Symmetry: D2
Amino acid sequence: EGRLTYGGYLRLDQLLSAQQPLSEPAHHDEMLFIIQHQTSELWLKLLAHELRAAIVHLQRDEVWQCRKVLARSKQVLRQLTEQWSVLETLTPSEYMGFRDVLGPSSGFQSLQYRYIEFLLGNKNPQMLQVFAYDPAGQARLREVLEAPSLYEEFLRYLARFGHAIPQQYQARDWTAAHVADDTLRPVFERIYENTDRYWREYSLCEDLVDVETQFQLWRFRHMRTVMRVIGFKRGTGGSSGVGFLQQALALTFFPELFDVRTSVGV
Amino acid sequence: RLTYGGYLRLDQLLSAQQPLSEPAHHDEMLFIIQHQTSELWLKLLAHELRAAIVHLQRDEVWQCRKVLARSKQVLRQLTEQWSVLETLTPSEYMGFRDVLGPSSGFQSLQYRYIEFLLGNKNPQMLQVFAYDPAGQARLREVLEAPSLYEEFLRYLARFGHAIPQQYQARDWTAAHVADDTLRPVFERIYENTDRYWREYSLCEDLVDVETQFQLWRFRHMRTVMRVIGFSSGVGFLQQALALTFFPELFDVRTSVGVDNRPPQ
Amino acid sequence: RLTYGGYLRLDQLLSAQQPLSEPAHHDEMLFIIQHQTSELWLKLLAHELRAAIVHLQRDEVWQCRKVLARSKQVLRQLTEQWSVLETLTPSEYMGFRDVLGPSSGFQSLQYRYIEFLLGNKNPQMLQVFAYDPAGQARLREVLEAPSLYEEFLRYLARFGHAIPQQYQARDWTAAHVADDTLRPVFERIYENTDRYWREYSLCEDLVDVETQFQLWRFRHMRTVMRVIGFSSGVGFLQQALALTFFPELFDVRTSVGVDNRPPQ
Amino acid sequence: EGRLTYGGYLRLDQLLSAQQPLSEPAHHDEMLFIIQHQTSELWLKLLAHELRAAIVHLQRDEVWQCRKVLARSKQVLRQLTEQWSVLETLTPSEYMGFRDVLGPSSGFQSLQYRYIEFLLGNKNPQMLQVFAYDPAGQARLREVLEAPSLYEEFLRYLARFGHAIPQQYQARDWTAAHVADDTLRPVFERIYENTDRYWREYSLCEDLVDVETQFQLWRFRHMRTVMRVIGFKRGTGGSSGVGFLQQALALTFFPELFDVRTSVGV
Ligand code: HEM
Ligand code: HEM
Ligand code: HEM
Ligand code: HEM
Ligand SMILES: N[C@@H](Cc1c[nH]c2ccccc12)C(=O)O
Ligand SMILES: N[C@@H](Cc1c[nH]c2ccccc12)C(=O)O
Ligand SMILES: N[C@@H](Cc1c[nH]c2ccccc12)C(=O)O
Ligand SMILES: N[C@@H](Cc1c[nH]c2ccccc12)C(=O)O
Ligand SMILES: N[C@@H](Cc1c[nH]c2ccccc12)C(=O)O
Ligand SMILES: N[C@@H](Cc1c[nH]c2ccccc12)C(=O)O
Ligand SMILES: N[C@@H](Cc1c[nH]c2ccccc12)C(=O)O
Ligand SMILES: N[C@@H](Cc1c[nH]c2ccccc12)C(=O)O
Ligand SMILES: [Mn+2]
Ligand SMILES: [Mn+2]
Ligand SMILES: [Mn+2]
Ligand SMILES: [Mn+2]
């Protein structure tokens, strides 16, 4: 159909022909497994689309626009987090009926997910290997890898307005994951200590805290779902499974924002 | 097949987002993805509802309930996701709505499948799918088969319930009409849950499914209202809220009351 | 004050659940707690909405938005919690509904406060609170004061917007009537968000608040429908869905369209 | 008003006069702080009410009734978990405006919460000390402490139907928290390996997994909220704060149910 019809515009012939279970005979629960991932991948694509715009707004000092885009980003992350409730209706007995059809593949190979991790700041050049089979996508990942993260662009925004931001944030090896910077503590303390004056900065700090918290919630529900489905069995990717996902919850995108809590109003 | 992206056919899935606006409008991606995620969930919902029907045809109560439990969760995601589209403002929509066609989800085959399966049969709807004789035939099969509700009634008939003989054979293509003779049947079930726990649990599962479906319809309407404002249009969506899949289940609420409980 | 239970006054709070059924019916506790949690949330909502009004009176936009953000979250909890009551079946309710009085949340003072604050003023409602002259007077104060919406309009008037002079002084006890002269005002705001971002963001916050409130009304109605089935009754709840707090905000959707964007 | 009026039935004069902020002047955000806890305490009271009934149903082999009560229990836990989203709008700058008015009190002193923990199996006789000031409530906690938990009643249910349940579960020191029992693995493996036959047991196992998962989600959101409000500052109760809440996520009510995942369909 033409791009002006409902199905043609949405390219449903292509979208709705992408569900191909491998189990033989076809296991009833494999459709859920596939759709759970595909809906997530679509939301991740939208999330990346929105986050990229949030970065551009920050670079241009467009605060309200940045916040609006981040508001939608939070709603998308919330859908990604809420949907785990569907997959939790998948029991170990059902999963073991087709887990074998799956190869040594895993979410590790999710290009879109890695894209988000990179955009938020959890850079990992060593992650470019898993996508060696695909140079095209690998290239797009490299771009974000070599560019300032959402968090670093926020720091650059603060720098443009006279905040005491270290000179290194003007230019450095962006491919290296951000490391907790103690010198940023006084910067955020000032913001939280005078919110009427630094309302723009204050609102953005809380938006970032919201984003990270929602992301961690996604990681937690992910881990808990894996736990109830495969328990402590090793993952098809090669990790310890739950153990590895448990360590992921220890990661932090915006450490200084959480650390400042300990000194606010001291 | 062997890799994450290969198994999930992501090259195909992630190349299905093609905005028409040019210069490309930032908010068109949301418009597309909002529909596509919904279509994927609707496909899963049909997959599960078909299984629920099979379980009823096999007198498999707990299995039917488990499948319906997942169905409720899928309907819940479809309902909750409207919150994302609510961030689409009139200012943003007016920037790309002009390049879009004049259709809506009214043209969704997957959605019509759900309506049909639940019992809201409409032979006239087959016309809109004339362009697709394949999907038209696939939809006609559901149209000619008993709905999820009618299969529940047939299940009840197989176990002593006073289900009218008409439910054994009739023109299933016609949408179910409220049957007052079913009132005593549901009253007996709700008035003796200790004995009719299977039937009672299924009745409540159906009420859950319909209620969640109505919530989807309401959130849909409220989202459309805040985007384009106020048959067809939002008026048609308002009328959809007056539709009911399992009327007798809601009607029985007004007459249940016999107390068959033992000494307490 | 010094201890957890003392500070939260739990001895008082947790001794307020007194079922009337005897023998006590297991499901009456839910009925009570469902109402009490809602009343607590409504109290917080009034607390926040009052603050939102103060911020508008002080031209404090970001503060108003932050308070409204919390208000939306409170309304969301009030809406989501209906899922708990949906597990109350007709079979269970018929076991204790007889000992209950003939009233409903229509008699909720806290709820009426919210309706009034949002603009749905009704002097006649003061009568139902005649038994409580104190609460009647506290409610009358909100009745005689500009609503959250009218304070938003007054804020707009202070900054060059073509707000009618009538909004400077009038009988606030009367519910706001749809004003077509406000259409060009909101069109200008939505057609130049780069300049009117403050106004644009507040307009959308109000649409969010009203939409979430309507979702609460809908879930309320659907829950009542599945418990007791189908002016007064569910018919009255159905009519409540036709009420609107900020009509002009929804109406402008049908006429926005001027494109003031720079070259792109 | 009489118990037949709306306000009289719900005892609103008493319920709505229980919000007494201590800050001076009255801090705007203290009302949220109080109401957030009071709504939670009301849901916890309902949860305990429902869980007690679930236990009675299990003792009487009333499976569908038990499941229905657990379904409502899950919905209540979901409300308790979802509401954290309201409290997350409370920033460090707002909280520090009245955190001082609060004494050395903490959720540790929540009798209703401890009641739930005990009912689920996380027994701790040493926790009877914190409620020494209140012998009345302390007594009610002791009852559940000395009685079989929800999980142990499930095991006793399985025992009544011929499942290979250890004799110790017929009578033992219930005040002692349940310890992971390896001998239960074969019992749950059999259930998950033949769900058509053991559908009753299967459904109950999944209900318990649902309950524990939802409870852990509550613990996680609790911890994340504390993290964004007070950061890594020590709690008013006396613990490390986030660190302590982090260890709480390591606790498990029904270990055998999660451990069996590793051997299901081996
Ligand atoms: C049956 C349900 C699921 C199970 C058992 C499961 C299991 C796992 C395991 C064991 C890992 C660790 C790597 C390995 O050794 O394989 C992993 C990683 C990952 N999974 Fe899941 N998964 C499930 C569903 C999902 C869904 C629906 C998504 C959404 C697209 C997803 C996204 C991811 C991602 C993005 C990683 C990489 C994380 C990182 O590098 O931190 N998984 N999964
Ligand atoms: C802001 C975006 C949207 C607008 C303005 C809109 C508008 C409408 C309107 C006016 C109708 C009534 C029938 C007609 O006149 O064509 C309709 C129906 C429908 N729409 Fe929406 N829609 C939007 C987004 C969506 C999304 C994301 C979905 C999910 C796939 C969806 C699904 C449907 C369905 C399934 C019907 C058929 C309902 C029925 O036959 O009762 N729409 N839409
Ligand atoms: C199964 C239990 C419930 C039933 C059968 C029920 C029924 C009704 C009915 C029939 C009305 C219409 C006015 C009237 O005729 O009195 C009403 C109004 C109302 N109810 Fe519900 N209700 C229930 C639970 C609740 C709960 C838990 C709340 C939360 C506090 C609540 C809040 C309200 C409010 C605020 C109104 C006034 C609405 C308005 O004036 O638009 N109800 N209820
Ligand atoms: C401003 C928000 C909050 C903060 C900063 C906070 C902080 C803390 C901290 C630091 C602890 C550890 C013990 C200590 O050293 O004090 C704790 C424990 C606890 N809190 Fe929270 N809390 C908050 C809100 C809530 C709410 C709304 C509830 C719901 C009633 C709650 C329930 C509990 C419970 C039940 C424990 C005991 C847990 C256990 O023994 O595992 N808290 N809280
Ligand atoms: N972060 C929350 C609360 C919030 C709204 N506006 C704010 C401004 C500043 C700080 C926090 C907020 C939200 O985005 O809803
Ligand atoms: N890694 C998962 C399997 C898996 C989860 N999601 C996937 C998506 C595609 C392929 C495999 C997977 C496991 O250990 O069972
Ligand atoms: N029908 C809308 C556009 C639209 C809504 N939903 C759609 C789905 C697909 C394509 C277009 C649409 C219009 O008036 O233009
Ligand atoms: N219908 C609700 C409540 C429920 C659970 N089990 C039931 C059995 C019978 C009737 C209602 C129920 C649910 O599915 O969660
Ligand atoms: N009005 C209902 C009972 C009821 C509903 N909500 C209430 C709140 C409080 C007291 C009673 C009620 C009846 O017909 O009896
Ligand atoms: N109203 C939505 C979306 C939004 C965020 N910021 C905005 C600014 C202007 C208009 C809309 C928005 C929200 O509050 O999340
Ligand atoms: N545990 C999920 C899924 C479920 C429903 N019925 C079941 C029966 C057996 C196992 C799991 C289920 C729920 O309660 O909704
Ligand atoms: N323990 C919390 C204070 C707290 C949270 N909830 C409470 C309820 C009552 C009294 C104190 C509290 C802190 O460290 O800040
Ligand atoms: Mn059979
Ligand atoms: Mn009768
Ligand atoms: Mn000022
Ligand atoms: Mn005009």
